[model samples]
Target chain A: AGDIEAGKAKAAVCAACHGQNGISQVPIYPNLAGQKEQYLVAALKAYKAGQRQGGQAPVMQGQATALSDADIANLAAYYASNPAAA
Target chain B: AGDIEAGKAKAAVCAACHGQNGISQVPIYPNLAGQKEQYLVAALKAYKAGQRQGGQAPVMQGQATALSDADIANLAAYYASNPAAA
Candidate 1:
């Protein structure tokens, strides 16, 4: 469980590639909007711990390293609530 | 960039967790339905090459190792064309 509002505020740094609302501007970046919260959390954790590789793994690893447990949870919750393409 | 029908036939082994149509029955399994084809292809390739780690990485690695380039492409196309939950 996380605070949506806090997550929104924290998500500001993620806006460049992930979009302000979790939709990616580039195809290389994954759109996080409407993704499952649990999945997002797991992914973030993996990136943070450098357990995942390939694609933008290095980029994601850097980003995820700064996140705390609450930050990951909040971000996941925030992104999960957004709308994705149909 | 692949044959959807062939992919469908090849996806029989993935039905247990990923479902017959790419929608996972379990929460731990990420739904592949309607996902971006490029993303899917890259993911499978990464798994096959053992470039990815974490979560079900080991399981996926085994599965992906058995797939050819054509098999990966076909599976990606088939899953990308499927419907995801709204």
Candidate 2:
């Protein structure tokens, strides 16, 4: 299992677009709060592997490239547990 | 902004891959429960317009082509409000 606290701490860098609680401040960025952990992990892995593409692919690719498997797992866990905005 | 009951009724068609509650039974299919409504709308529109491409693009494109703007909106709202499985 991933560590939620560790993920929360490491997620500071993601706050610029995805917000502090995994909700996105910008419309272009998708909210991550309360998302499925497995799906999030798969998405992050796809970005890192350059297997996914979209308008925000380049930015997400750059961000995801730096994440390890454990990091991805932790982030997914934290985000999945977070509350989404209304 | 959309009717939850209408979305729920229409979403019966989606129960094949995406569960009745918006969670996916298949791993490749991303769970939609509790996702951001606006993001879901954008994705559905993108799929319909053939602007978004990925592994599941073709399938999603085919599915989204039949959805009207209101249908997309209703689906997004329903999925956004649904409870995600743990």
Candidate 3:
């Protein structure tokens, strides 16, 4: 498993949209609290590589463009730590 | 503006599915890095409210079922700050 501590450090940019607790306030944003780690990494790579497109593409592309493989892994680990609340 | 440092602390759960940097690794998962703040917040609310459905609904639904409005807004702000790659 990746380091939650490291992942937490790297999650700085994600809070603007995903929230500190993983719940998204907007109607279009997806909840990331309990998402799969592998899926998260794959999606980030796709956005950075320009493989994904959507109304949110411009913003996603910018944020994803700077991610390194290690950064992605750590971030994935951090978010996966929290489970969805009951 | 909210604190990127604080957002990073709250992003732990998100990294599991949305990737450390907000990119998703799945074909069905949408990229979150550069998504619009307003749009991202809207999307998350839809998922939590059951207004949105998709193949990934099961996972997303479970993830989104519990989220506060502030959590969503902070996350949106965190991810929106980063610009997509050129």
Measured by lDDT, the strongest candidate is: 1
Ordering by TM-score: 1, 2, 3
The CAPRI classification for model 1 reads as medium
Candidates by lDDT, descending order: 1, 2, 3
Error of 3 at B80 (Å): 23
lDDT of 3: 0.66
**What TM-score, over all chains together, does every model reach?**
0.85, 0.70, 0.50
User: Model 1, stretches more than 4 Å misplaced?
Assistant: none
Per-residue error at A49 for model 1, in Å?
1.0
lDDT of 3 by residue, A1-86 (tens): 46778888778778778778666667456556655676667666666776555456567778888988788888877876666331
Reported per model, the fraction of native interface contacts reproduced equals 0.37, 0.31, 0.08
lDDT of candidate 2 over A1-86, digit per residue (tens): 68899999889998888988787877678878876677778778868877655555677889999999999989998987886543
Q: State the TM-score of the second chain for every model.
A: 0.94, 0.94, 0.83
Provide the lowest-lDDT 10-residue window in model 3 chain B: B77-86
- DockQ-superior candidate, 2 or 3: 2
On TM-score, the leading prediction is: 1
